[PDB]
């Protein structure tokens, strides 16, 4: 009936003139534009207690304020998570606290905080409080009095956070969360006497290790017969990256998986393809293994 | 400023020659006539208004506050505000950070000349207001704060308790205020105090600070224009630097009068 040859283009300009077309051509071969298969992730490399004052347990820093750090890198993205410390004087979810992050994604622009920088800062605060990581009983201060000679047996700790994402290539909501969970386990609360903090003495933070979790995003892509037919078949892509996937994929699943088959947060947006219960169970099981490898990656 | 490329090549060729012909004909060691008014703000301890030949006008006010010097680091804070420019502008914070170094408490000005009790001391607030400007005003503000500090009067101390001051008598502020000069290099000639058209076609600029009859620490070499930016021979760095050592006493003799 019809026979017309199409127009060919090199793979370099295929992703520029149409990210949707370049994304469909990769899925016909079982590959992604990130040179990865369907359920393939990215390796990570972290460095805890590297930028903190307590980096060397024997030779403490003379002038430093950071309590803990974590330089996370997944693929070509770079995440730096430092944590500063404060203190406030005081006179079921209400028994827990959270963090105050300042996400600053560097994309080469100037101005106030981007809509992306302000959405990650609040989603991190909302996930820490609901997952129950920092109980309010762990923020209390056993404040003594020095006369020097300091002694130990109302004040409460205030913990800040500043995350600087570099070389962004996709949704970095999952990278900041995983980097924060690593940087949380490395901070130490300095002792305080009567209020002044101690120069060398520190106390490890009481983190609820039962409810710790890690992040992992997924995507549901709907194919098409015009790129290598009643109905069709949809595939699941793990860990979205590159401008091609983030723009075309309009159906994602980001979840926080904890050990012992527990979950802390789930977002189920089904704008693009239809999200069947098949891919719901697959994303949940694919995240439990992701949280087990991250929690047992270096520690 | 904004000129045409036709006249930019004319001023470039006339200032880079061996005679070093200046636009207005002044010698490389000469200056332009300046009017300076002092003591006109009763609500402030010191005050000065300076008017340049090209129309640049700047006002400086000086306030004082008793503060514990054992907990107050810097005792000389300079607040610069340029009309028509934002407070967070790039050209405003640079001079704000540069003047804080030429008038640093302890370096540019010794803190012993404004101490009271062994615990408390006077903090000098230098408020700068630039009404109009056509070139780099760091050299004009230095001339304004100079006449303002030398015309400043602070209350006399009466004498560990809280200090008390006299009602009528007020002591004079005996402080040696550093001076800032601007030098522009055109190819191989040095120009002391450039103009709006001289600094627009120049190759590079020099900022020298003068205090206590000598060249003090805070000096710079910022470019005066982004068009013609050229590197200079080190022999030009010491030429203009030693050139101000000969004519700056003639500036202070005419300024401290």
């Amino acid at each position: 009936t019809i026979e017309i040859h199409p127009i060919t283009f090199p793979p370099e300009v295929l992703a520029r003139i149409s990210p949707e077309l370049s994304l469909q051509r990769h899925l016909s071969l079982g590959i992604r534009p990130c040179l990865r298969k369907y359920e393939e992730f990215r390796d990570v490399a972290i460095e805890n207690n590297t930028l903190s004052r307590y980096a060397d347990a024997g030779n403490i820093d003379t002038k430093n304020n950071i309590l803990g750090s974590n330089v996370l890198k997944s693929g070509k993205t770079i995440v730096i998570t430092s944590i500063t410390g404060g203190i406030i004087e005081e006179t079921i979810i209400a028994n827990y606290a959270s963090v105050y992050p300042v996400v600053e994604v560097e994309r080469g622009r100037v101005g106030a905080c981007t809509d992306e920088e302000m959405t990650i800062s609040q989603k991190l605060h909302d996930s820490i409080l609901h997952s129950r990581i920092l109980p309010k009983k762990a923020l209390k201060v056993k404040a003594g009095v020095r006369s020097f000679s300091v002694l130990y047996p109302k004040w409460s700790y205030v913990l800040y956070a500043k995350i600087v994402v570099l070389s962004r290539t996709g949704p970095v909501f999952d990278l900041c969360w995983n980097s924060l969970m690593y940087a949380l386990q490395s901070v130490k609360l300095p002792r305080a006497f009567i209020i002044i903090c101690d120069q060398t003495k520190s106390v490890p933070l009481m983190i609820n290790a039962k409810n710790i979790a890690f992040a992992s995003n997924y995507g549901i892509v709907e194919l098409d017969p015009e790129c290598q037919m009643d109905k069709l078949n949809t595939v699941l892509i793990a860990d979205l990256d590159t401008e091609a996937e983030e723009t075309s994929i309009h159906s994602t699943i980001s979840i926080l998986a904890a050990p012992s088959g527990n979950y802390k947060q789930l977002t189920l947006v089904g704008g693009g393809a239809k999200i069947t219960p098949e891919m719901i169970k697959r994303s949940l099981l694919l995240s439990r293994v992701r949280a087990d490898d991250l929690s047992t990656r270096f520690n | 400023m904004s000129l045409s490329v036709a006249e930019k090549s004319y001023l470039y060729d006339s200032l880079a020659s061996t005679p070093s012909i200046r636009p207005d004909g002044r010698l490389p060691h000469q200056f332009r006539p300046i009017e300076i008014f002092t003591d006109f703000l009763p609500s402030s301890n010191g005050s000065s208004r300076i008017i340049a030949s090209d129309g640049s006008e700047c006002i400086v006010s000086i306030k004082s506050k008793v503060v514990d010097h054992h907990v107050e680091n810097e005792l000389l804070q300079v607040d610069v505000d340029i009309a028509g420019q934002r407070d967070d502008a790039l050209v405003v914070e640079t001079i704000t950070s540069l003047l804080n170094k030429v008038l640093k408490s302890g370096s540019g000005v010794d803190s012993s000349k404004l101490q009271l009790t062994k615990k408390y001391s006077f903090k000098i607030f230098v408020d700068v207001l630039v009404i109009s400007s056509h070139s780099h005003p760091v050299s004009l503000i230095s001339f304004a704060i100079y006449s303002a500090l030398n015309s400043t009067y602070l209350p006399k101390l009466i004498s560990e308790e809280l200090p008390t001051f006299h009602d009528y008598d007020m002591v004079k502020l005996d402080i040696n205020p550093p001076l800032v000069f601007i030098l522009a290099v055109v190819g191989n000639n040095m120009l002391l105090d450039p103009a709006a058209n001289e600094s627009e076609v120049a190759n590079n600029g020099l900022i020298i600070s003068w205090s206590n009859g000598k060249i003090t620490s805070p000096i710079r070499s910022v470019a005066l224009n982004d068009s013609n930016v050229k590197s200079f021979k080190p022999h030009l760095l010491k030429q203009g630097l030693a050139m101000v050592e000969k004519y700056a006493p003639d500036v202070v003799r005419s300024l401290e009068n």
């Binding site: 009936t1 793979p11 040179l35 990215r42 390796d43 890198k73 770079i78 490898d293 | -």
Partner: protein, 157 residues
């Protein structure tokens, strides 16, 4: 106005000035003796013969008909005129270049070992263990995609 080649400017100059002299001679408007429509037609057809001016397809005026032999002789004068003008110490400065040329490792301190790390993709097995893929595995998939991209030359239904 009528898109006349600039090479024929010497022709329209002779006709415009002749149109003006005749208009002044008989006290007529220049368009009465020759409108702009007829002017562009005479410079395009270039009627060399006495008949080409009077038997024109668009029509002529009274002054053009009475002066048909004169105008047909002017274009012949301009045609032979527009055709008449168309025919008518290194080595002393090279050694200075070579004598001036005679005037001429820590892996990491803190973050130099984490940032310059190249891409590393991993795969999850059935039990749940990481499986790193080699840089050659992703290279096989790269050329396999570019070769299969320019091999589409037919579309069926």
């Amino acid at each position: 106005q009528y898109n006349i080649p600039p090479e024929r400017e010497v022709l329209v100059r002779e006709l415009y000035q002749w149109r003006d002299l005749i208009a002044r001679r008989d006290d007529e408007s220049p368009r009465f003796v020759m409108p702009n429509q007829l002017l562009a037609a005479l410079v395009a057809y270039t009627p060399t013969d006495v008949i080409g001016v009077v038997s024109l397809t668009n029509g002529v005026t009274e002054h053009v008909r009475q002066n048909a032999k004169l105008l047909a002789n002017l274009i012949r004068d301009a045609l032979r005129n527009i055709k008449n003008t168309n025919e008518e110490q290194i080595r002393d400065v090279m050694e200075r270049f070579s004598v001036l040329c005679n005037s001429n490792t820590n892996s990491s301190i803190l973050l130099g070992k984490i940032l310059p790390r190249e891409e590393h993709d991993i795969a999850y097995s059935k039990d749940g263990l990481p499986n790193k893929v080699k840089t050659e595995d992703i290279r096989i998939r790269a050329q396999n995609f570019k070769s299969a991209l320019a091999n589409l030359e037919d579309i069926i239904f």
